[PDB]
Amino acid sequence: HPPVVLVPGDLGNQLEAKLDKPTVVHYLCSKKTESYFTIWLNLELLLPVIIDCWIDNIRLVYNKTSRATQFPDGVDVRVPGFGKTFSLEFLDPSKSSVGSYFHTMVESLVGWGYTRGEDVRGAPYDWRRAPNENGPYFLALREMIEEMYQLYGGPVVLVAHSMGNMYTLYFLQRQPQAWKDKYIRAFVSLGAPWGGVAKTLRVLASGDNNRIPVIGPLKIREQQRSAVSTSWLLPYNYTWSPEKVFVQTPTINYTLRDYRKFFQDIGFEDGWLMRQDTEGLVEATMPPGVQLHCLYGTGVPTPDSFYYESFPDRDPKICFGDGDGTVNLKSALQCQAWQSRQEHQVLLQELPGSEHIEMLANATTLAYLKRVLLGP
Numbered sequence: 001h002p003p004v005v006l007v008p009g010d011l012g013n014q015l016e017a018k019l020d021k022p023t024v025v026h027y028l029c030s031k032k033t034e035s036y037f038t039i040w041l042n043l044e045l046l047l048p049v050i051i052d053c054w055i056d057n058i059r060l061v062y063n064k065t066s067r068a069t070q071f072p073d074g075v076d077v078r079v080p081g082f083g084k085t086f087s088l089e090f091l092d093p094s095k096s097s098v099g100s101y102f103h104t105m106v107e108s109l110v111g112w113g114y115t116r117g118e119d120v121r122g123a124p125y126d127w128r129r130a131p132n133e134n135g136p137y138f139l140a141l142r143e144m145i146e147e148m149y150q151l152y153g154g155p156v157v158l159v160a161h162s163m164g165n166m167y168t169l170y171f172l173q174r175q176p177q178a179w180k181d182k183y184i185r186a187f188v189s190l191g192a193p194w195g196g197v198a199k200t201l202r203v204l205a206s207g208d209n210n211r212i213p214v215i216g217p218l219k220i221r222e223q224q225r226s227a228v229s230t231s232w233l234l235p236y237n238y239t240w241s242p243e244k245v246f247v248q249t250p251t252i253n254y255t256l257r258d259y260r261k262f263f264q265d266i267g268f269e270d271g272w273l274m275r276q277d278t279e280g281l282v283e284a285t286m287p288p289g290v291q292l293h294c295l296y297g298t299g300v301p302t303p304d305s306f307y308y309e310s311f312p313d314r315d316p317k318i319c320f321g322d323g324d325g326t327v328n329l330k331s332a333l334q335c336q337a338w339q340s341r342q343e344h345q346v347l348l349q350e351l352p353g354s355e356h357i358e359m360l361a362n363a364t365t366l367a368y369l370k371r372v373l374l375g376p
């Protein structure tokens with residue numbers, strides 16, 4: 001069986017922080033730590049009041065001079081477990097079910113004969129950033145793939161979930177075809193938001209606390225806006241009509257041609273600068289140039305557009321279309337477009353009724369992967 005590299009999505013691996021801060025927002029926040037501690041995922045950091053400490057540490061600061069993000073003063077954030085699987089199997093190091101992410105899939109791989117940290121490895125990254133600020137990650141990924149090829153005697157299968165697919169596409173678009181033909185066996189793409197997702201507009205405008213309802217959407221919006229990866233995944237015109245309205249309010253409409261106005265009108269001008277920084281990273285039409293298995297969920301109501309009676313500080317009414325709950329179905333047309341643009345095969349596989357996160361632990365998904373890895 002071929003070596004496997006796992007690429008997670010947004011929120012999809014642990015992050016650790018170390019502190020020596022000049023000031024804190026509440027007295028109950030730690031100023032200084034002697035070592036790194038887990039900043040994602042630890043449920044105790046997300047409780048009311050304490051969550052302000054977490055926001056103050058996990059937010060990114062956008063520097064308009066350098067056009068780059070930086071950590072807050074006296075904060076360092078690192079990504080543990082590169083080359084291992086623990087930090088993407090369990091988001092919470094307590095190993096609570098709330099953070100079980102790639103664990104079910106890795107249990108299956110190991111049952112099929114894989115070895116954690118050897119012929120199956122994770123490629124975790126700082127998912128708050130877009131690929132323009134993760135150069136060193138891509139160098140390490142290239143090196144890890146080459147090492148796995150040399151150690152285990154053949155090309156690697158990349159398995160990516162959600163935003164990890166856009167990270168993987170960026171990487172592959174930038175490697176020579178001869179490198180890909182030698183080192184990459186196949187790319188199994190699970191729930192890829194090719195062309196962005198509509199729900200990013202609601203996140204940026206009014207916040208999304210759906211997974212932390214005891215905290216205010218306007219409070220969590222602070223962190224969500226600060227993550228460059230959010231603005232990177234706003235809808236693109238190679239998937240969506242430039243005239244489709246994503247956000248309606250009593251006085252104005254916003255389409256994907258209206259992002260500059262949108263960012264001005266929600267009071268977050270840095271988001272426009274982030275979008276400018278990131279909108280050109282992934283080449284609109286260029287296929288990955290490897291054997292591709294595109295697995296996409298359908299039959300789950302997926303946010304398509306939003307109507308605000310009061311904008312932007314109140315929750316909107318939601319209009320739903322088809323997809324997997326998060327990724328709009330029209331992302332799949334991107335893979336379909338790649339069929340005629342690359343020589344390597346592109347296989348499309350619909351997963352009816354498969355929700356965005358559940359697809360990672362779903363028996364049908366795992367049976368498909370087994371066929372890719374172990375053969376007929």
Ligand SMILES: *[C@@H]1O[C@H](CO)[C@@H](O)[C@H](O)[C@H]1NC(C)=O
Nearest residue numbers: 061062063064065066067070
């Ligand atoms: C912004 O980045 C510039 C250029 O690197 C640097 O000189 C400046 O100190 C940064 N600003 C802050 C507040 O760190």
Ligand SMILES: *[C@@H]1O[C@H](CO)[C@@H](O)[C@H](O)[C@H]1NC(C)=O
Nearest residue numbers: 235236237238242257279280
């Ligand atoms: C498509 O979007 C890009 C930015 O993402 C923009 O530069 C380009 O003009 C758009 N093309 C259209 C509307 O034809």
Ligand SMILES: *[C@@H]1O[C@H](CO)[C@@H](O)[C@H](O)[C@H]1NC(C)=O
Nearest residue numbers: 245248249250251252253254
């Ligand atoms: C936005 O467009 C909708 C139709 O898509 C229209 O009915 C509405 O009047 C428009 N709103 C504004 C503020 O122009």
Ligand SMILES: *[C@@H]1O[C@H](CO)[C@@H](O)[C@H](O)[C@H]1NC(C)=O
Nearest residue numbers: 351352353354358362363364
């Ligand atoms: C798993 O995915 C299959 C294929 O899409 C779907 O029919 C099934 O309902 C899913 N299982 C669960 C528990 O959702």
Ligand SMILES: [Cl-]
Nearest residue numbers: 291343344345
């Ligand atoms: Cl092929």
